[PDB]
Amino acid sequence: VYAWNRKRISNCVADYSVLYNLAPFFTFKCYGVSPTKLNDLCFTNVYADSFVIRGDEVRQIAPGQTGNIADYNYKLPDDFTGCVIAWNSNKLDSKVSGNYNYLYRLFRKSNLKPFERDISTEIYQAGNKPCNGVAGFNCYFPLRSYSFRPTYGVGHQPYRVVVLSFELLHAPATVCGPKKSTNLVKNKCVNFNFNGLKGTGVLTESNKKFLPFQQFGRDIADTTDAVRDPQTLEILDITPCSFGGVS
């Protein structure tokens, strides 16, 4: 948690349905966005922060929250945007000898700024006489080691926490979600919607040969009459369905 890893996610589609088998018993309580509508959403910036904290310390991962993890290990900004995911890992991060490999910062001169990492191993001076490299009384190592106790409740068990931070510009988007598709129906009055281009008309085979970069097709009336299907590279004519005045 003190040396928390930071990861960049971009230029990809984010699928959130996978995060049930990989991370069972997960908690998706988060801030800044509705969890449900994340599937049809676009993110321009994504940060991933992952570490392991104790069960009693999972509540400390929240904006405006103070504590041992918050002040000395990982501080969240008040205006934090993005969501956090935490699930139990007793089957993975618990050893019969003891999970002594996970350390956290315990003594620190001042509370950490949001989204900051401290890897210093200097001996902390909690008194008046300088430590001078001695770890005796009034001179404690700033980092202590987790001693996970699976025998007790979940508060003394290793919790794997992954912190995701976004910005939600949804204009220069590089991370988005799937939208699926339906099979093509032709030669009838059809409500179509191609990449957000909703319209009604009759979809017929098109003889036009517009260039590979060239996507749409416009007319004199400055309306889209020709379209190329994103699923299959084919040319379609969009014609308004037969109409006319009745007398």
Partner: antibody, heavy 122, light 111 residues
């Protein structure tokens, strides 16, 4: 505990050899991991391949040791490593690393065996 | 995936002198790193596991500093008997790795 090696001898190029790591005083428990390493006579250590001593062997291999080598467990206190198509550069000193944590891979190695020397000549 | 280098290759300090060996990783390995030292004709032994915790039977002079990508081992004192090679292990992600162990760094103590 000891992890004395076996099966080390002069071998012709393009051949096969069977190196055996035998444990003494303990058995290959599931909660603790074992790995295999070797040391060239002139340069530092390297990792090639090894398997876990658990119920489900989480066998793991190195990039330069992708398919030439083969490691399997034959008994609770006997593990063997098989390599084929041995070349001139394969000569080294082979050690039987003993891990301390079963995180699906070589973690901190607290105990090593005395090791064996495998050389190639024609 | 992770490529680790150990520098300097050769070091030489007086018996009362201090020498430091730094171990650098291609990407962050957090706290997962170990230090190993072998004498000629002898397999190496674990010295500094988790990059800070001292081993058993080892003098306190052996220590560890740094975290994430750069890890440094500082030698406070030699006694002409610690002249050997030091290696660092990534012990972080070994799915497809050519070698978890780092480069070789022998220590020469001029007594």
């Amino acid at each position: 505990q000891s992890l004395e090696e076996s099966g080390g001898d002069l071998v012709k190029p393009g051949a096969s050899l069977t190196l055996t790591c035998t444990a003494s005083g303990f058995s290959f428990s599931s909660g603790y991991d074992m790995c295999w390493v070797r040391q060239a006579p002139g340069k530092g250590l390297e990792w090639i391949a090894c398997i876990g001593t658990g119920s489900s062997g989480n066998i793991y291999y190195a990039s330069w040791a992708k398919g030439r080598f083969t490691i399997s467990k034959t008994s609770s206190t006997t593990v063997t490593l098989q390599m084929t198509s041995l070349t001139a550069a394969d000569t080294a000193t082979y050690f039987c690393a003993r891990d301390d944590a079963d995180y699906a891979g070589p973690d901190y190695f607290n105990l090593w065996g005395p090791g064996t020397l495998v050389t190639v000549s024609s | 995936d992770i490529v680790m280098t150990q520098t300097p290759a050769s070091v030489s300090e007086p018996v009362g002198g201090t020498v430091t060996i730094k171990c650098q990783a291609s990407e962050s390995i957090s706290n997962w790193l170990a230090w190993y030292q072998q004498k000629p004709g002898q397999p190496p032994k674990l010295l500094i596991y988790a990059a800070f915790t001292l081993a058993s039977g080892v003098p306190s002079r052996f220590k560890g500093s740094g975290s994430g990508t750069q890890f440094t081992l500082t030698i406070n004192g030699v006694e002409c008997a610690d002249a050997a090679t030091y290696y660092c292990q990534q012990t972080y992600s070994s799915r497809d790795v050519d070698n978890v162990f780092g480069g070789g760094t022998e220590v020469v103590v001029k007594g």
